[PDB]
Design a protein around this ligand. Sequence first.
Ligand SMILES: CO[C@@H]1CN(Cc2cn(-c3ccnc(Nc4cnc5c(c4)c(C(=O)C4CC4)cn5C)n3)nc2C)C[C@@H]1O
Ligand SMILES: CO[C@@H]1CN(Cc2cn(-c3ccnc(Nc4cnc5c(c4)c(C(=O)C4CC4)cn5C)n3)nc2C)C[C@@H]1O
Lengths: 263, 263
Amino acid sequence: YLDRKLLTLEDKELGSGNFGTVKKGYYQMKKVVKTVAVKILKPALKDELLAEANVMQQLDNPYIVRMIGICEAESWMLVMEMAELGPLNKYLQQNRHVKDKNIIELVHQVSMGMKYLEESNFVHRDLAARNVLLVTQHYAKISDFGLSKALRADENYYKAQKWPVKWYAPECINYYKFSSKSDVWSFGVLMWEAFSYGQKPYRGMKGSEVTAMLEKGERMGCPAGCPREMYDLMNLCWTYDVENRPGFAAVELRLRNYYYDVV
Amino acid sequence: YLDRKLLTLEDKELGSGNFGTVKKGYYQMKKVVKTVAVKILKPALKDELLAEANVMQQLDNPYIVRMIGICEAESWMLVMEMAELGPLNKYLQQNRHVKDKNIIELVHQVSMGMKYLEESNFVHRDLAARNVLLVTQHYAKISDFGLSKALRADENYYKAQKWPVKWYAPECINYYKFSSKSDVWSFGVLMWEAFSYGQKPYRGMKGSEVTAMLEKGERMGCPAGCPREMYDLMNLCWTYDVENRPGFAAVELRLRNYYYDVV
Ligand SMILES: CO[C@@H]1CN(Cc2cn(-c3ccnc(Nc4cnc5c(c4)c(C(=O)C4CC4)cn5C)n3)nc2C)C[C@@H]1O
Ligand SMILES: CO[C@@H]1CN(Cc2cn(-c3ccnc(Nc4cnc5c(c4)c(C(=O)C4CC4)cn5C)n3)nc2C)C[C@@H]1O
Protein backbone atom coordinates (compact mmCIF):
# COMPACT_ATOMS: atom_id res chain seq x y z
CA TYR A 1 0.00 0.00 0.00
CA LEU A 2 1.45 3.26 -1.25
CA ASP A 3 1.24 6.74 0.20
CA ARG A 4 -1.06 8.89 -1.92
CA LYS A 5 0.93 11.99 -0.98
CA LEU A 6 4.01 10.47 -2.66
CA LEU A 7 2.05 9.91 -5.91
CA THR A 8 1.55 12.68 -8.50
CA LEU A 9 -0.91 11.93 -11.33
CA GLU A 10 -0.94 13.73 -14.66
CA ASP A 11 -4.33 15.06 -15.67
CA LYS A 12 -4.56 13.68 -19.19
CA GLU A 13 -5.04 9.95 -19.55
CA LEU A 14 -2.79 7.71 -21.61
CA GLY A 15 -5.68 5.38 -22.35
CA SER A 16 -9.08 4.15 -21.35
CA GLY A 17 -10.98 0.89 -21.20
CA ASN A 18 -13.91 -0.77 -19.50
CA PHE A 19 -11.83 -1.04 -16.28
CA GLY A 20 -11.21 2.68 -16.06
CA THR A 21 -8.15 4.53 -17.22
CA VAL A 22 -4.37 4.48 -17.41
CA LYS A 23 -2.52 7.62 -16.34
CA LYS A 24 1.09 8.64 -16.15
CA GLY A 25 2.39 9.64 -12.77
CA TYR A 26 5.36 9.99 -10.47
CA TYR A 27 6.13 8.18 -7.25
CA GLN A 28 8.57 9.78 -4.86
CA MET A 29 11.23 7.30 -3.70
CA LYS A 30 13.89 7.83 -1.03
CA LYS A 31 15.67 10.33 -3.32
CA VAL A 32 14.79 9.73 -6.96
CA VAL A 33 11.34 9.98 -8.44
CA LYS A 34 10.04 7.06 -10.47
CA THR A 35 7.87 7.54 -13.54
CA VAL A 36 4.86 5.24 -13.21
CA ALA A 37 1.86 4.06 -15.15
CA VAL A 38 -1.24 3.88 -13.03
CA LYS A 39 -4.30 1.72 -13.70
CA ILE A 40 -7.26 3.56 -12.13
CA LEU A 41 -10.60 1.79 -11.60
CA LYS A 42 -14.03 3.18 -12.58
CA PRO A 43 -17.54 -4.84 -6.08
CA ALA A 44 -15.96 -7.23 -8.57
CA LEU A 45 -13.52 -4.78 -10.21
CA LYS A 46 -11.87 -4.00 -6.88
CA ASP A 47 -11.41 -7.68 -6.11
CA GLU A 48 -9.98 -8.20 -9.58
CA LEU A 49 -7.49 -5.36 -9.15
CA LEU A 50 -6.30 -6.70 -5.78
CA ALA A 51 -5.87 -10.15 -7.33
CA GLU A 52 -3.94 -8.64 -10.29
CA ALA A 53 -1.63 -6.84 -7.90
CA ASN A 54 -1.18 -9.98 -5.82
CA VAL A 55 0.05 -11.86 -8.93
CA MET A 56 2.40 -9.08 -9.97
CA GLN A 57 3.88 -8.74 -6.48
CA GLN A 58 5.10 -12.36 -6.74
CA LEU A 59 6.85 -11.92 -10.10
CA ASP A 60 10.45 -10.79 -10.44
CA ASN A 61 11.79 -10.91 -14.00
CA PRO A 62 13.25 -8.34 -16.44
CA TYR A 63 10.63 -9.13 -19.09
CA ILE A 64 7.60 -8.61 -16.83
CA VAL A 65 6.13 -5.28 -15.77
CA ARG A 66 7.04 -4.46 -12.13
CA MET A 67 4.34 -3.32 -9.74
CA ILE A 68 5.20 -0.59 -7.25
CA GLY A 69 2.06 -1.06 -5.22
CA ILE A 70 -1.62 -0.33 -4.79
CA CYS A 71 -3.09 2.95 -3.60
CA GLU A 72 -6.62 3.34 -2.26
CA ALA A 73 -7.52 6.95 -2.74
CA GLU A 74 -10.03 8.88 -4.78
CA SER A 75 -10.32 5.57 -6.68
CA TRP A 76 -8.46 2.22 -6.47
CA MET A 77 -5.11 2.36 -8.25
CA LEU A 78 -2.46 -0.13 -9.38
CA VAL A 79 0.89 1.70 -9.71
CA MET A 80 3.46 0.13 -12.05
CA GLU A 81 6.85 1.05 -13.50
CA MET A 82 6.22 2.96 -16.76
CA ALA A 83 6.95 1.31 -20.12
CA GLU A 84 7.19 4.57 -22.09
CA LEU A 85 6.54 3.29 -25.61
CA GLY A 86 3.22 1.61 -24.76
CA PRO A 87 1.52 -1.45 -26.24
CA LEU A 88 3.43 -3.41 -28.87
CA ASN A 89 0.58 -3.75 -31.36
CA LYS A 90 0.00 0.01 -31.51
CA TYR A 91 3.75 0.72 -31.66
CA LEU A 92 4.19 -1.59 -34.64
CA GLN A 93 1.11 -0.13 -36.37
CA GLN A 94 2.77 3.32 -36.05
CA ASN A 95 6.32 2.07 -36.94
CA ARG A 96 5.86 -0.16 -39.94
CA HIS A 97 9.58 -0.17 -40.84
CA VAL A 98 10.82 -1.86 -37.63
CA LYS A 99 13.16 -4.50 -38.91
CA ASP A 100 12.44 -8.21 -38.87
CA LYS A 101 15.46 -8.87 -36.64
CA ASN A 102 14.02 -6.36 -34.13
CA ILE A 103 10.67 -8.19 -34.12
CA ILE A 104 12.49 -11.47 -33.42
CA GLU A 105 14.37 -9.78 -30.54
CA LEU A 106 11.12 -8.55 -28.94
CA VAL A 107 9.19 -11.82 -29.29
CA HIS A 108 12.17 -13.69 -27.88
CA GLN A 109 12.07 -11.35 -24.85
CA VAL A 110 8.39 -12.19 -24.41
CA SER A 111 9.31 -15.90 -24.56
CA MET A 112 11.91 -15.35 -21.79
CA GLY A 113 9.30 -13.69 -19.60
CA MET A 114 6.89 -16.55 -20.30
CA LYS A 115 9.55 -19.20 -19.58
CA TYR A 116 9.86 -17.55 -16.15
CA LEU A 117 6.09 -17.39 -15.67
CA GLU A 118 5.89 -21.11 -16.55
CA GLU A 119 8.70 -21.96 -14.09
CA SER A 120 6.76 -19.97 -11.49
CA ASN A 121 3.57 -21.97 -12.17
CA PHE A 122 1.42 -18.98 -13.15
CA VAL A 123 -0.81 -18.95 -16.22
CA HIS A 124 -1.19 -15.56 -17.88
CA ARG A 125 -4.51 -16.21 -19.73
CA ASP A 126 -4.42 -13.02 -21.81
CA LEU A 127 -1.11 -13.21 -23.75
CA ALA A 128 -1.66 -10.94 -26.76
CA ALA A 129 0.39 -8.24 -28.42
CA ARG A 130 -1.66 -5.47 -26.76
CA ASN A 131 -0.40 -6.87 -23.41
CA VAL A 132 3.25 -6.53 -24.32
CA LEU A 133 4.56 -3.08 -23.43
CA LEU A 134 7.76 -1.52 -24.79
CA VAL A 135 10.38 0.07 -22.54
CA THR A 136 12.45 0.86 -25.62
CA GLN A 137 12.26 -0.25 -29.26
CA HIS A 138 14.55 -3.14 -28.11
CA TYR A 139 13.03 -4.06 -24.74
CA ALA A 140 9.58 -5.67 -24.27
CA LYS A 141 7.77 -6.50 -20.99
CA ILE A 142 4.60 -8.55 -20.43
CA SER A 143 1.76 -6.72 -18.74
CA ASP A 144 -1.89 -7.23 -17.88
CA PHE A 145 -2.20 -9.92 -15.24
CA GLY A 146 -5.95 -9.37 -14.63
CA LEU A 147 -6.87 -12.90 -15.81
CA SER A 148 -3.73 -14.59 -14.48
CA LYS A 149 -3.92 -17.46 -12.01
CA ALA A 150 -1.47 -19.07 -9.59
CA LEU A 151 -1.72 -22.77 -10.27
CA ARG A 152 -2.54 -25.11 -7.40
CA ALA A 153 0.33 -27.15 -6.10
CA ASP A 154 -1.36 -30.36 -7.25
CA GLU A 155 -2.49 -29.32 -10.74
CA ASN A 156 -0.91 -28.26 -13.96
CA TYR A 157 -3.90 -26.22 -15.13
CA TYR A 158 -6.53 -23.78 -13.91
CA LYS A 159 -10.15 -24.82 -14.50
CA ALA A 160 -12.50 -21.92 -15.19
CA GLN A 161 -16.16 -21.90 -14.17
CA LYS A 162 -15.86 -12.03 -22.05
CA TRP A 163 -12.84 -14.11 -23.10
CA PRO A 164 -10.12 -13.22 -25.70
CA VAL A 165 -11.06 -16.32 -27.66
CA LYS A 166 -8.98 -15.53 -30.76
CA TRP A 167 -5.99 -16.06 -28.51
CA TYR A 168 -7.20 -19.21 -26.74
CA ALA A 169 -6.18 -22.79 -27.32
CA PRO A 170 -8.81 -25.45 -28.15
CA GLU A 171 -8.65 -27.00 -24.66
CA CYS A 172 -9.49 -23.59 -23.20
CA ILE A 173 -12.60 -23.32 -25.34
CA ASN A 174 -13.67 -26.97 -25.08
CA TYR A 175 -12.71 -27.92 -21.51
CA TYR A 176 -12.09 -24.53 -19.79
CA LYS A 177 -8.57 -25.76 -18.86
CA PHE A 178 -5.76 -23.19 -18.84
CA SER A 179 -2.12 -24.30 -18.57
CA SER A 180 1.26 -22.86 -19.53
CA LYS A 181 0.81 -24.86 -22.77
CA SER A 182 -2.40 -22.86 -23.38
CA ASP A 183 -0.31 -19.70 -22.99
CA VAL A 184 2.07 -21.18 -25.63
CA TRP A 185 -0.85 -21.27 -28.10
CA SER A 186 -1.58 -17.58 -27.32
CA PHE A 187 2.10 -16.83 -27.79
CA GLY A 188 1.83 -18.18 -31.35
CA VAL A 189 -0.98 -15.72 -32.01
CA LEU A 190 1.14 -12.95 -30.45
CA MET A 191 4.00 -13.89 -32.77
CA TRP A 192 1.65 -13.70 -35.77
CA GLU A 193 0.48 -10.27 -34.58
CA ALA A 194 4.04 -8.99 -34.12
CA PHE A 195 5.26 -10.18 -37.53
CA SER A 196 2.06 -8.61 -38.98
CA TYR A 197 2.95 -5.20 -37.43
CA GLY A 198 0.00 -5.21 -35.12
CA GLN A 199 -2.76 -6.45 -37.41
CA LYS A 200 -5.61 -8.15 -35.57
CA PRO A 201 -5.59 -11.96 -35.91
CA TYR A 202 -8.42 -13.83 -37.70
CA ARG A 203 -9.51 -10.59 -39.32
CA GLY A 204 -13.19 -10.35 -40.15
CA MET A 205 -14.06 -13.58 -38.33
CA LYS A 206 -16.42 -14.35 -35.50
CA GLY A 207 -15.24 -16.46 -32.59
CA SER A 208 -17.32 -19.40 -33.79
CA GLU A 209 -15.76 -19.06 -37.21
CA VAL A 210 -12.29 -19.18 -35.63
CA THR A 211 -13.23 -22.38 -33.78
CA ALA A 212 -14.52 -23.89 -37.01
CA MET A 213 -11.36 -22.92 -38.92
CA LEU A 214 -9.05 -24.40 -36.30
CA GLU A 215 -11.14 -27.56 -36.06
CA LYS A 216 -10.68 -28.03 -39.84
CA GLY A 217 -6.92 -28.00 -39.17
CA GLU A 218 -6.49 -24.59 -40.79
CA ARG A 219 -4.15 -21.89 -39.46
CA MET A 220 -3.44 -18.29 -40.33
CA GLY A 221 -1.07 -17.70 -43.22
CA CYS A 222 2.53 -16.53 -42.98
CA PRO A 223 2.80 -12.69 -42.56
CA ALA A 224 4.56 -10.75 -45.30
CA GLY A 225 8.28 -10.79 -44.63
CA CYS A 226 8.11 -13.34 -41.82
CA PRO A 227 10.95 -15.92 -41.92
CA ARG A 228 9.92 -19.49 -42.60
CA GLU A 229 11.53 -20.61 -39.32
CA MET A 230 9.35 -18.19 -37.37
CA TYR A 231 6.19 -19.30 -39.16
CA ASP A 232 7.17 -22.87 -38.42
CA LEU A 233 7.44 -21.94 -34.73
CA MET A 234 4.02 -20.22 -34.78
CA ASN A 235 2.57 -23.40 -36.18
CA LEU A 236 4.22 -25.56 -33.51
CA CYS A 237 2.68 -23.25 -30.88
CA TRP A 238 -0.69 -23.94 -32.60
CA THR A 239 -0.44 -27.67 -32.03
CA TYR A 240 -4.04 -28.77 -31.37
CA ASP A 241 -3.28 -31.48 -28.81
CA VAL A 242 -1.99 -29.84 -25.62
CA GLU A 243 0.13 -32.85 -24.71
CA ASN A 244 2.06 -32.54 -28.00
CA ARG A 245 2.46 -28.77 -27.88
CA PRO A 246 5.85 -27.44 -26.68
CA GLY A 247 6.35 -25.61 -23.39
CA PHE A 248 8.04 -22.24 -23.11
CA ALA A 249 11.49 -23.70 -22.44
CA ALA A 250 11.45 -25.30 -25.89
CA VAL A 251 9.89 -22.22 -27.49
CA GLU A 252 12.39 -19.78 -25.94
CA LEU A 253 15.32 -21.99 -26.99
CA ARG A 254 14.14 -22.07 -30.60
CA LEU A 255 13.73 -18.29 -30.66
CA ARG A 256 17.07 -17.75 -28.91
CA ASN A 257 18.93 -19.88 -31.40
CA TYR A 258 17.26 -18.30 -34.41
CA TYR A 259 17.81 -14.78 -33.12
CA TYR A 260 21.53 -15.32 -32.60
CA ASP A 261 21.70 -16.82 -36.13
CA VAL A 262 20.19 -13.69 -37.66
CA VAL A 263 22.39 -11.52 -35.43
CA TYR B 1 -37.80 -31.06 -23.26
CA LEU B 2 -40.14 -33.08 -25.48
CA ASP B 3 -39.90 -36.70 -26.63
CA ARG B 4 -38.92 -36.84 -30.31
CA LYS B 5 -40.80 -40.10 -30.73
CA LEU B 6 -44.08 -38.38 -29.76
CA LEU B 7 -43.45 -35.74 -32.46
CA THR B 8 -44.44 -36.34 -36.10
CA LEU B 9 -43.28 -33.73 -38.64
CA GLU B 10 -44.82 -33.15 -42.05
CA ASP B 11 -42.33 -33.14 -44.91
CA LYS B 12 -43.39 -29.94 -46.65
CA GLU B 13 -42.46 -26.69 -44.93
CA LEU B 14 -45.07 -24.06 -44.11
CA GLY B 15 -42.42 -21.36 -44.46
CA SER B 16 -38.76 -20.49 -44.31
CA GLY B 17 -36.52 -17.64 -43.31
CA ASN B 18 -33.06 -16.91 -42.02
CA PHE B 19 -34.53 -18.27 -38.78
CA GLY B 20 -34.67 -21.80 -40.32
CA THR B 21 -38.02 -23.35 -41.28
CA VAL B 22 -41.53 -23.72 -39.89
CA LYS B 23 -43.21 -27.11 -40.27
CA LYS B 24 -46.55 -28.55 -39.29
CA GLY B 25 -46.53 -31.56 -37.03
CA TYR B 26 -48.32 -33.55 -34.35
CA TYR B 27 -47.48 -34.11 -30.72
CA GLN B 28 -48.95 -37.16 -29.05
CA MET B 29 -50.54 -36.28 -25.69
CA LYS B 30 -51.87 -38.87 -23.27
CA LYS B 31 -54.86 -39.58 -25.53
CA VAL B 32 -55.42 -36.72 -27.96
CA VAL B 33 -52.95 -35.60 -30.55
CA LYS B 34 -52.17 -31.89 -30.73
CA THR B 35 -51.49 -30.17 -34.04
CA VAL B 36 -48.31 -28.11 -33.68
CA ALA B 37 -46.24 -25.59 -35.55
CA VAL B 38 -42.54 -26.26 -35.21
CA LYS B 39 -39.71 -23.75 -35.67
CA ILE B 40 -36.67 -25.73 -36.84
CA LEU B 41 -33.23 -24.15 -36.76
CA LYS B 42 -30.93 -24.41 -39.75
CA PRO B 43 -23.86 -21.22 -31.59
CA ALA B 44 -25.86 -17.98 -31.46
CA LEU B 45 -29.03 -19.39 -33.08
CA LYS B 46 -29.30 -22.16 -30.50
CA ASP B 47 -28.92 -19.75 -27.59
CA GLU B 48 -31.56 -17.47 -29.16
CA LEU B 49 -34.05 -20.33 -29.58
CA LEU B 50 -33.56 -21.42 -25.95
CA ALA B 51 -34.13 -17.83 -24.77
CA GLU B 52 -37.23 -17.55 -26.97
CA ALA B 53 -38.60 -20.72 -25.45
CA ASN B 54 -37.78 -19.52 -21.95
CA VAL B 55 -39.84 -16.35 -22.56
CA MET B 56 -42.81 -18.27 -23.97
CA GLN B 57 -42.82 -20.80 -21.11
CA GLN B 58 -43.52 -17.94 -18.66
CA LEU B 59 -46.48 -16.55 -20.59
CA ASP B 60 -50.05 -17.73 -20.07
CA ASN B 61 -52.66 -15.75 -21.95
CA PRO B 62 -55.32 -16.55 -24.59
CA TYR B 63 -53.89 -14.01 -27.03
CA ILE B 64 -50.30 -15.30 -26.95
CA VAL B 65 -49.06 -18.40 -28.78
CA ARG B 66 -48.54 -21.32 -26.34
CA MET B 67 -45.27 -23.23 -26.45
CA ILE B 68 -45.43 -27.01 -25.95
CA GLY B 69 -41.68 -27.40 -25.51
CA ILE B 70 -38.30 -27.73 -27.13
CA CYS B 71 -36.93 -30.84 -28.80
CA GLU B 72 -33.25 -31.46 -29.46
CA ALA B 73 -33.03 -33.91 -32.29
CA GLU B 74 -31.87 -33.84 -35.88
CA SER B 75 -32.00 -30.05 -35.42
CA TRP B 76 -33.13 -27.81 -32.53
CA MET B 77 -36.91 -27.35 -32.51
CA LEU B 78 -39.41 -25.08 -30.79
CA VAL B 79 -42.82 -26.81 -30.77
CA MET B 80 -45.87 -24.51 -30.44
CA GLU B 81 -49.66 -24.83 -30.61
CA MET B 82 -50.66 -24.40 -34.31
CA ALA B 83 -52.45 -21.21 -35.38
CA GLU B 84 -53.86 -22.65 -38.59
CA LEU B 85 -54.51 -19.49 -40.58
CA GLY B 86 -50.96 -18.20 -40.33
CA PRO B 87 -49.60 -14.65 -40.22
CA LEU B 88 -52.08 -11.78 -40.13
CA ASN B 89 -50.47 -9.65 -42.83
CA LYS B 90 -50.53 -12.49 -45.38
CA TYR B 91 -54.07 -13.48 -44.41
CA LEU B 92 -55.36 -9.95 -44.96
CA GLN B 93 -53.48 -9.66 -48.27
CA GLN B 94 -55.33 -12.81 -49.42
CA ASN B 95 -58.72 -11.79 -47.87
CA ARG B 96 -59.21 -8.17 -48.85
CA HIS B 97 -62.93 -8.15 -47.98
CA VAL B 98 -62.53 -8.89 -44.25
CA LYS B 99 -64.78 -6.33 -42.62
CA ASP B 100 -63.59 -3.30 -40.68
CA LYS B 101 -65.34 -4.56 -37.54
CA ASN B 102 -63.37 -7.84 -37.87
CA ILE B 103 -60.09 -5.90 -38.09
CA ILE B 104 -61.02 -3.96 -34.96
CA GLU B 105 -61.79 -7.28 -33.21
CA LEU B 106 -58.39 -8.73 -34.10
CA VAL B 107 -56.31 -5.67 -33.18
CA HIS B 108 -58.20 -5.42 -29.89
CA GLN B 109 -57.23 -9.06 -29.20
CA VAL B 110 -53.59 -8.12 -29.85
CA SER B 111 -53.95 -5.21 -27.41
CA MET B 112 -55.27 -7.65 -24.75
CA GLY B 113 -52.24 -9.92 -25.22
CA MET B 114 -49.97 -6.88 -25.02
CA LYS B 115 -51.69 -5.55 -21.89
CA TYR B 116 -50.86 -8.91 -20.32
CA LEU B 117 -47.27 -8.80 -21.59
CA GLU B 118 -46.91 -5.29 -20.10
CA GLU B 119 -48.33 -6.42 -16.74
CA SER B 120 -45.83 -9.33 -16.87
CA ASN B 121 -42.91 -6.90 -17.44
CA PHE B 122 -41.80 -8.40 -20.77
CA VAL B 123 -41.03 -6.29 -23.83
CA HIS B 124 -41.80 -7.94 -27.14
CA ARG B 125 -39.51 -5.88 -29.38
CA ASP B 126 -40.82 -7.24 -32.70
CA LEU B 127 -44.56 -6.37 -32.62
CA ALA B 128 -45.61 -6.35 -36.26
CA ALA B 129 -48.51 -7.81 -38.19
CA ARG B 130 -46.34 -10.66 -39.51
CA ASN B 131 -45.93 -11.71 -35.86
CA VAL B 132 -49.67 -11.95 -35.19
CA LEU B 133 -50.99 -15.41 -36.07
CA LEU B 134 -54.63 -16.30 -36.68
CA VAL B 135 -56.31 -19.25 -34.96
CA THR B 136 -59.54 -18.37 -36.77
CA GLN B 137 -60.68 -15.31 -38.71
CA HIS B 138 -61.91 -13.98 -35.31
CA TYR B 139 -59.05 -15.04 -33.00
CA ALA B 140 -55.51 -13.57 -33.12
CA LYS B 141 -52.45 -14.55 -31.05
CA ILE B 142 -49.08 -12.87 -30.72
CA SER B 143 -46.08 -14.91 -31.75
CA ASP B 144 -42.36 -14.49 -32.36
CA PHE B 145 -40.64 -13.87 -29.02
CA GLY B 146 -37.08 -14.14 -30.40
CA LEU B 147 -36.22 -10.50 -29.54
CA SER B 148 -38.29 -10.34 -26.36
CA LYS B 149 -36.77 -9.53 -22.99
CA ALA B 150 -37.80 -9.98 -19.37
CA LEU B 151 -37.32 -6.60 -17.76
CA ARG B 152 -35.05 -6.31 -14.73
CA ALA B 153 -36.87 -5.87 -11.46
CA ASP B 154 -35.36 -2.40 -10.98
CA GLU B 155 -35.83 -1.03 -14.53
CA ASN B 156 -38.74 -0.34 -16.78
CA TYR B 157 -36.77 -0.72 -20.01
CA TYR B 158 -34.27 -3.02 -21.66
CA LYS B 159 -31.07 -1.33 -22.90
CA ALA B 160 -29.62 -2.90 -26.02
CA GLN B 161 -25.91 -2.99 -26.79
CA LYS B 162 -30.63 -6.21 -37.89
CA TRP B 163 -33.59 -4.42 -36.30
CA PRO B 164 -37.19 -3.97 -37.58
CA VAL B 165 -36.65 -0.20 -37.57
CA LYS B 166 -39.93 0.72 -39.31
CA TRP B 167 -41.66 -0.63 -36.22
CA TYR B 168 -39.43 1.01 -33.63
CA ALA B 169 -40.09 4.07 -31.51
CA PRO B 170 -37.66 7.01 -31.59
CA GLU B 171 -36.20 6.17 -28.15
CA CYS B 172 -35.34 2.70 -29.45
CA ILE B 173 -33.46 4.19 -32.37
CA ASN B 174 -31.84 7.08 -30.46
CA TYR B 175 -31.15 5.63 -27.02
CA TYR B 176 -31.47 1.84 -27.55
CA LYS B 177 -34.11 1.77 -24.76
CA PHE B 178 -37.01 -0.71 -25.15
CA SER B 179 -40.04 -0.49 -22.84
CA SER B 180 -43.67 -1.51 -23.02
CA LYS B 181 -44.28 2.04 -24.28
CA SER B 182 -41.92 1.25 -27.17
CA ASP B 183 -44.10 -1.77 -27.94
CA VAL B 184 -47.10 0.63 -27.99
CA TRP B 185 -45.43 2.55 -30.84
CA SER B 186 -44.95 -0.74 -32.72
CA PHE B 187 -48.58 -1.56 -32.03
CA GLY B 188 -49.58 1.65 -33.84
CA VAL B 189 -47.64 0.47 -36.88
CA LEU B 190 -49.33 -2.94 -36.56
CA MET B 191 -52.74 -1.23 -36.49
CA TRP B 192 -51.82 0.68 -39.63
CA GLU B 193 -50.75 -2.58 -41.29
CA ALA B 194 -53.99 -4.36 -40.34
CA PHE B 195 -56.32 -1.55 -41.49
CA SER B 196 -54.20 -1.49 -44.71
CA TYR B 197 -54.86 -5.24 -45.28
CA GLY B 198 -51.25 -6.20 -44.85
CA GLN B 199 -49.50 -3.51 -46.82
CA LYS B 200 -45.96 -2.82 -45.68
CA PRO B 201 -45.61 0.42 -43.67
CA TYR B 202 -43.45 3.34 -44.94
CA ARG B 203 -43.45 1.79 -48.36
CA GLY B 204 -40.62 2.72 -50.64
CA MET B 205 -38.62 4.30 -47.81
CA LYS B 206 -35.26 3.52 -46.30
CA GLY B 207 -34.86 3.39 -42.55
CA SER B 208 -33.07 6.74 -42.49
CA GLU B 209 -35.92 8.26 -44.47
CA VAL B 210 -38.40 6.93 -41.90
CA THR B 211 -36.39 8.48 -39.06
CA ALA B 212 -36.27 11.74 -40.99
CA MET B 213 -40.03 11.70 -41.62
CA LEU B 214 -40.84 11.00 -37.96
CA GLU B 215 -38.43 13.71 -36.78
CA LYS B 216 -40.33 16.23 -38.98
CA GLY B 217 -43.43 15.26 -37.04
CA GLU B 218 -44.95 13.46 -40.06
CA ARG B 219 -46.89 10.21 -39.74
CA MET B 220 -48.41 7.75 -42.18
CA GLY B 221 -51.81 8.66 -43.57
CA CYS B 222 -55.11 7.07 -42.68
CA PRO B 223 -55.74 3.74 -44.52
CA ALA B 224 -58.71 3.58 -46.85
CA GLY B 225 -61.83 2.72 -44.88
CA CYS B 226 -60.17 3.11 -41.49
CA PRO B 227 -62.40 4.81 -38.89
CA ARG B 228 -61.21 8.20 -37.71
CA GLU B 229 -61.23 6.92 -34.11
CA MET B 230 -58.81 4.15 -35.05
CA TYR B 231 -56.51 6.54 -36.91
CA ASP B 232 -56.61 8.80 -33.87
CA LEU B 233 -55.50 5.86 -31.72
CA MET B 234 -52.69 5.00 -34.18
CA ASN B 235 -51.47 8.55 -33.88
CA LEU B 236 -51.61 8.43 -30.06
CA CYS B 237 -49.45 5.28 -30.19
CA TRP B 238 -47.02 7.33 -32.34
CA THR B 239 -46.51 9.91 -29.62
CA TYR B 240 -42.84 10.91 -29.94
CA ASP B 241 -42.05 11.45 -26.24
CA VAL B 242 -42.22 8.08 -24.49
CA GLU B 243 -43.34 9.64 -21.21
CA ASN B 244 -46.45 11.07 -22.93
CA ARG B 245 -47.30 7.95 -24.91
CA PRO B 246 -50.07 5.71 -23.49
CA GLY B 247 -49.45 2.25 -22.05
CA PHE B 248 -51.35 -0.84 -23.17
CA ALA B 249 -53.98 -0.55 -20.43
CA ALA B 250 -55.13 2.76 -21.93
CA VAL B 251 -54.80 1.45 -25.51
CA GLU B 252 -56.75 -1.75 -24.85
CA LEU B 253 -59.54 0.21 -23.14
CA ARG B 254 -59.90 2.59 -26.06
CA LEU B 255 -60.07 -0.33 -28.49
CA ARG B 256 -62.47 -2.25 -26.24
CA ASN B 257 -64.87 0.66 -26.01
CA TYR B 258 -64.76 1.37 -29.73
CA TYR B 259 -65.27 -2.26 -30.66
CA TYR B 260 -68.34 -2.60 -28.47
CA ASP B 261 -69.66 0.66 -30.01
CA VAL B 262 -69.35 -0.88 -33.47
CA VAL B 263 -70.75 -4.20 -32.20
C1 LIG C 1 -6.71 -1.71 -23.03
O1 LIG C 1 -5.32 -2.00 -23.20
C2 LIG C 1 -4.77 -3.11 -22.40
C3 LIG C 1 -4.94 -2.78 -20.94
N1 LIG C 1 -3.60 -2.50 -20.40
C4 LIG C 1 -3.69 -1.57 -19.46
C5 LIG C 1 -2.31 -1.46 -18.70
C6 LIG C 1 -1.27 -0.60 -19.07
N2 LIG C 1 -0.23 -0.82 -18.24
C7 LIG C 1 1.07 -0.22 -18.27
C8 LIG C 1 2.05 -0.67 -17.39
C9 LIG C 1 3.29 -0.10 -17.53
N3 LIG C 1 3.47 0.79 -18.53
C10 LIG C 1 2.46 1.18 -19.33
N4 LIG C 1 2.75 2.13 -20.34
C11 LIG C 1 1.85 2.72 -21.27
C12 LIG C 1 2.42 3.76 -22.00
N5 LIG C 1 1.72 4.44 -22.96
C13 LIG C 1 0.47 4.08 -23.12
C14 LIG C 1 -0.16 3.00 -22.41
C15 LIG C 1 0.56 2.32 -21.45
C16 LIG C 1 -1.51 2.99 -23.00
C17 LIG C 1 -2.59 2.02 -22.58
O2 LIG C 1 -2.38 1.24 -21.68
C18 LIG C 1 -3.89 2.15 -23.38
C19 LIG C 1 -4.48 0.85 -23.93
C20 LIG C 1 -5.06 1.50 -22.67
C21 LIG C 1 -1.58 4.00 -23.97
N6 LIG C 1 -0.42 4.53 -23.94
C22 LIG C 1 -0.12 5.66 -24.88
N7 LIG C 1 1.22 0.65 -19.24
N8 LIG C 1 -0.52 -1.80 -17.31
C23 LIG C 1 -1.78 -2.15 -17.60
C24 LIG C 1 -2.46 -3.23 -16.76
C25 LIG C 1 -2.71 -2.28 -21.55
C26 LIG C 1 -3.37 -3.13 -22.66
O3 LIG C 1 -3.00 -2.65 -23.97
C1 LIG D 1 -40.77 -14.92 -41.19
O1 LIG D 1 -42.05 -14.95 -40.57
C2 LIG D 1 -42.11 -14.72 -39.13
C3 LIG D 1 -41.43 -15.84 -38.37
N1 LIG D 1 -42.46 -16.54 -37.59
C4 LIG D 1 -42.13 -17.80 -37.49
C5 LIG D 1 -43.10 -18.52 -36.49
C6 LIG D 1 -44.28 -19.16 -36.84
N2 LIG D 1 -44.85 -19.63 -35.70
C7 LIG D 1 -46.11 -20.28 -35.54
C8 LIG D 1 -46.63 -20.56 -34.28
C9 LIG D 1 -47.89 -21.07 -34.21
N3 LIG D 1 -48.60 -21.23 -35.36
C10 LIG D 1 -48.03 -20.93 -36.55
N4 LIG D 1 -48.83 -21.12 -37.70
C11 LIG D 1 -48.47 -20.93 -39.08
C12 LIG D 1 -49.42 -21.39 -39.97
N5 LIG D 1 -49.26 -21.27 -41.32
C13 LIG D 1 -48.13 -20.71 -41.74
C14 LIG D 1 -47.11 -20.20 -40.86
C15 LIG D 1 -47.31 -20.32 -39.50
C16 LIG D 1 -46.14 -19.66 -41.81
C17 LIG D 1 -44.87 -19.00 -41.34
O2 LIG D 1 -44.62 -18.90 -40.16
C18 LIG D 1 -43.98 -18.46 -42.46
C19 LIG D 1 -43.28 -17.13 -42.22
C20 LIG D 1 -42.50 -18.42 -42.07
C21 LIG D 1 -46.61 -19.89 -43.11
N6 LIG D 1 -47.72 -20.49 -42.94
C22 LIG D 1 -48.52 -20.86 -44.15
N7 LIG D 1 -46.78 -20.41 -36.67
N8 LIG D 1 -44.06 -19.31 -34.59
C23 LIG D 1 -42.99 -18.68 -35.12
C24 LIG D 1 -41.90 -18.22 -34.18
C25 LIG D 1 -43.76 -16.17 -38.18
C26 LIG D 1 -43.50 -14.76 -38.73
O3 LIG D 1 -44.45 -14.39 -39.76
